[PDB]
Symmetry: C6
Subunit: 58 residues, 6 copies
């Protein structure tokens, strides 16, 4: 388990999450754990596994 | 090692799998690497590595 | 809680293993380690890496 | 635990089903935590375990 | 480990590189940070967090 | 932990990547997660997770 990750400072930000299948989420980040990012996308709440993310634009 | 996935135990969720399948699931258990679910009359062990997103 | 997993509880059971490539194994589980599942499928003996498994129906 | 079922395969003839759909008719010559060393035909290969789906033995 | 284990990627911090992602994209990138799990880059006028698991190769 | 990959340093090898590309490579360094190579007139950092097999 890493002690430092840049993903932590994404909390509360509006970002673009590029998923490994080619979909993109216009997301607001509501939580970050070592392996998950929690987001709101429109009216949906999602848990996103980091392993399913390629890049995040912020 | 805090995880949000553990908060989902007992809840109805939609699990989006890496192959494109979507599970209309009730979460029955969560471990470090697995999520146990009921889907219809099926009982499944789902590996987290095979999950992309979960809608809850 | 260290090393707790549900997969080892499938030991000795008949299960359906859904592999990441879309193949499905009608399997009898004979052993479970941290990263591997040992199974019998018909007359074949297989080592299945957990990373290659999507779901197991039991 | 310091246990791997893959270690049972050392020195054995096996079929390795890779994630890309290829199958290796392999003789296992070594097993590390992350790799399986094999002879296939006249070739020596390092096979990463993460690229393996199943092994028939 | 507070002092990182050796990795070649940290030598690329501050450099211009081409990152080849698993999805077939190439990023013309300036590396601005490296963690255990991520590589931070500037691409055009975009700021990206790139997960190492999504990278195949880096040409430098 | 033991890595067979360390033994490949300085050798000419064929690296079969997960996307189907094949690198005709000279290995110039090996770390826990990376293999550094020369291919043509290019220098590449290759993540081990992107490699399927290496012929050597
Ligand atoms: N220590 C942990 N605690 C909780 N979940 C984990 C842990 N390690 C890995 N995971 C999850 O399991 C997936 C597969 O693990 P790995 O094969 O180690 O990458 C990860 O991408 C996470 O979603
Ligand atoms: N402690 C670490 N030091 C350097 N790179 C790492 C470390 N942990 C993970 N990585 C990289 O991040 C990738 C993530 O894969 P995984 O750990 O399997 O989710 C690995 O394949 C490595 O390239
Ligand atoms: Cl650095
Ligand atoms: Na650390």
């Amino acid at each position: 388990i890493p002690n430092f990750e840049y993903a932590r400072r994404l909390n509360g930000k509006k970002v673009k999450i590029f998923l490994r299948n080619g979909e993109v989420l216009d997301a607001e980040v509501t939580g970050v754990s070592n392996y998950e990012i929690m987001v709101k996308v429109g009216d949906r709440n999602l848990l996103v596994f980091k392993h399913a993310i390629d890049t995040i634009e912020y």
